[PDB]
Design a protein around this ligand. Structure first.
Ligand SMILES: C[n+]1cccc(CC(O)(P(=O)(O)O)P(=O)(O)O)c1
Ligand SMILES: C[n+]1cccc(CC(O)(P(=O)(O)O)P(=O)(O)O)c1
Ligand SMILES: [Mg+2]
Ligand SMILES: [Mg+2]
Ligand SMILES: [Mg+2]
Ligand SMILES: [Mg+2]
Ligand SMILES: [Mg+2]
Ligand SMILES: [Mg+2]
Lengths: 341, 341
């Protein structure tokens, strides 16, 4: 199946990404260029690569095989890596802001001795590398401007979502009245759904000459719903996932987050259970985090999630029947395979 | 003179910038859009506006008065504000990374109670606003892509410079062997000179249809040298400026920075003076910072700076004679008036 079978070529392209991004070689900036290399190697490697792979997979399925020459394929791999660099940028910053410990099975970049808040600048550089690659590989192409604007708009939407995530989770401050379903859905749409799901497909679409507003709108209808489910899954796994598989320690309860779990908890709790949540949520103490987990399990939240995943899967399939044409349904189906496993 | 006489119109345009950036009005994102407003108001207001004003001034001097209609003037003011938003983005992050206390006569954004490291995301949003304004005001214009690429390339160069600034100043770590003149000049060229001086002129140039590589190269020759002097001045004022005028408390010595002052100090010190510097530089203790200042004054560094400012002024004027044509020398002269006062 198409992801595991594009992966190896995609991952190996990375050394080429790095080599080209390292050839501002103004010898004066050598030390900075060496730091950038270290940043890329630590922060763009070690995840599943699904976002960037979706660009490559979708490209193969949308573009005429006779138009898949060596050069247009290189361009597809680079644009895929651009989506991974955007993810790297976002995660480095998000880990600082969420006070996280590990990411992708290693200590977070900013927690590394000798890095600290220098990682703010490292994250901004990763972002800059996107537009540097687009220029180096794509500047002659009809879709150059489309891609630039797509990446910029995706970043803006994600930052708006991050803003809502952060505003809804003020540190050291109760009230659970904030944590509603309406609010939750807006957060994840902006913070997750656009850049994780719309962006990589849309990018492949523009690359294939599919630039019509109506087709992008239809694709977006499916892709934003997939993104909502994916963030709900990320929230569930924050508490109930195995860190050896997720690669990261969860912080949602201590960070006072509007998680899907807390929203579902609030919908189900007796007034007595509400008070337990209220006395215990949003705080660093292990014993307090453990009481919240216990309330979640008392309320059968893992069972609620398993049932939602099934409902969500069926709903997304219904949307693909409605909205996929005229693109190959396989494009969306491959994606859904990846997240609903 | 042209800056004080464009200022009032420029500053008043801000409420329009804010209003337009606040009209994603998706009511769901309202809380985020209100946070953005607060971010803009705190972080883009209260400086001298010289970078954005340079766009407006240069525009009036480069564009045929018959082509200065109401709409092209609005576009000039917006692009000016784009340069100020880039500065706001950079300063918010730089203040976190330099551990600063005040900026523009108020507490730094990230030090504000209830902000903290959320300011990382606030800074990224400010950056995103640039490209949002370019699209809203400039997308139909021949120079749209030129401007996008100029802002992106300026950001990349500045981030590379920030990288060198940070690498040369490792926290808690001596050696002064790092602090050379060669190194110093590379830092400030990248971190300061491109975005502070080349960017706003270049932007006006592209807006006026002046897109020739050779003309940009000539303009850059003057503007990068002005930028070097301006950063040298910023370093001098970090220690010897009056905070009520600069608007900020200096941190260069405690932050272990490759300041122009330390570089000049190192060039002049006896081995005994070297040891004092070495025992005292790069540390939070007021008494230690005071010994470094005392060494600087013992070495007459304020007198060395006054003499350099004069030499530098004459050199820059020589470059304007050489390199200005065919642009009006007034463009560069206005700028030099602003910084050499
Ligand atoms: C910028 N951004 C957008 C969406 C998601 C994440 C990252 C997260 O999914 P978050 O739970 O913080 O939202 P992670 O820390 O759990 O990996 C970061
Ligand atoms: C990103 N960037 C580039 C150049 C300058 C500054 C800001 C400074 O000039 P720095 O002394 O830190 O270099 P300031 O704190 O003194 O205002 C920030
Ligand atoms: Mg996180
Ligand atoms: Mg987060
Ligand atoms: Mg999470
Ligand atoms: Mg600073
Ligand atoms: Mg700095
Ligand atoms: Mg300074």
């Amino acid at each position: 199946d198409v992801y595991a079978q594009e992966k190896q070529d995609f991952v190996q392209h990375f050394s080429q990404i790095v080599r080209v991004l390292t050839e501002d070689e103004h010898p004066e900036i050598g030390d900075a260029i060496a730091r950038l290399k270290e940043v890329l190697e630590y922060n763009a490697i070690g995840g599943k690569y699904n976002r960037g792979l979706t660009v490559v997979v979708a490209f193969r399925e949308l573009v005429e095989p006779r138009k898949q020459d060596a050069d247009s394929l290189q361009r597809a791999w680079t644009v895929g890596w651009c989506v991974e660099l955007l993810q790297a940028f976002f995660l480095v910053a998000d880990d600082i802001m969420d006070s996280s410990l590990t990411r992708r099975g290693q200590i977070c970049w900013y927690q590394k001795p000798g890095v600290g808040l220098d990682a703010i600048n490292d994250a901004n550089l990763l972002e800059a590398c996107i537009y540097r690659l687009l220029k180096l590989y794509c500047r002659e192409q009809p879709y150059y401007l489309n891609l630039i604007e797509l990446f910029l708009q995706s970043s803006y939407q994600t930052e708006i979502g991050q803003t809502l995530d952060l505003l809804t989770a003020p540190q050291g401050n109760v009230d659970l009245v904030r944590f509603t379903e309406k609010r939750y859905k807006s957060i994840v749409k902006y913070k997750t759904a656009f850049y994780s799901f719309y962006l990589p497909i849309a990018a492949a679409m523009y690359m294939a000459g599919i630039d019509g507003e109506k087709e992008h709108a239809n694709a977006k209808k499916i892709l934003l719903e997939m993104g909502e489910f994916f963030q709900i899954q990320d929230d569930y796994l924050d508490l109930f996932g195995d860190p050896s598989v997720t690669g990261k320690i969860g912080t949602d309860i201590q960070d006072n987050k509007c998680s899907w779990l807390v929203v579902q908890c609030l919908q189900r709790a007796t007034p007595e259970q509400y008070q337990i949540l209220k006395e215990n949520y949003g705080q660093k103490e292990a014993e307090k985090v453990a009481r919240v987990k216990a309330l979640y399990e008392e309320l059968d939240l893992p069972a609620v999630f398993l049932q939602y995943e099934e409902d969500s899967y069926s709903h997304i399939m219904a949307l693909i029947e409605q909205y996929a044409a005229p693109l190959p349904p396989a494009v969306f189906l491959g994606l859904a395979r990846k997240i609903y496993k």
